[PDB]
Amino acid sequence: RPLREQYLHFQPISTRWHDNDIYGHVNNVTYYAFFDTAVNTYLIERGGLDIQGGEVIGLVVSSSCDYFAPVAFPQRIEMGLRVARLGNSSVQYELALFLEGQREACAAGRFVHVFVERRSSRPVAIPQELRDALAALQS
Template structure:
């Protein structure tokens, strides 16, 4: 089995969102439950997309579907840690893209978890992939590394 890649650092990511943890996020072992990592990824991506004007909350014109996701855990985090979610563009296609994420606890420089969300833009009525608009493409290119 190949050696595991070390955790990324904050400098590896372009845009950040600060997210609080909640007491309910801890599991029986006293650290963030695995599903919370995905919720943090989803919240950070959605907040970034909303800030860029890329997210149609009602899905009236287009919908952004998550078609694949993953997470690699490096260390533990727990309530009351403050999480800083870093984002960067992993891949950009015609109608789809991958956002890579790093989760950092408090002021630590090494990610405690890293993951990705692959998304595709589909028409709200057709449900079929549609090319990204120039505005969405430009927003995604701003977080390219």
């Protein structure tokens, strides 16, 4: 079960009222909202994009998540982030959700960005800013 140390960058995301579903914990779907929020915050601040903005955007082609221990609004949650592999027009992220002050991830997942030209949605090489920012998150 993944550990804080195995991740390079960390982001706190506040939990919301309706994050809880009928069974009292954060809905399993919400984890992915946390995933792509966490990644794109990093791409925005440390990487250029430009979501309003640029002619290059990231498209999610796959994701997946595993769930180990539940969590609940209003607990304070944070995301570890790391980059696993990094092709030319694509990249693969590893994310995990940590409850504040815990060594053990509550869930952990991966997802894959393909960067494309906005209008054409055809793949492109990753612009240097982003590619360097992305690289900085590699183990």
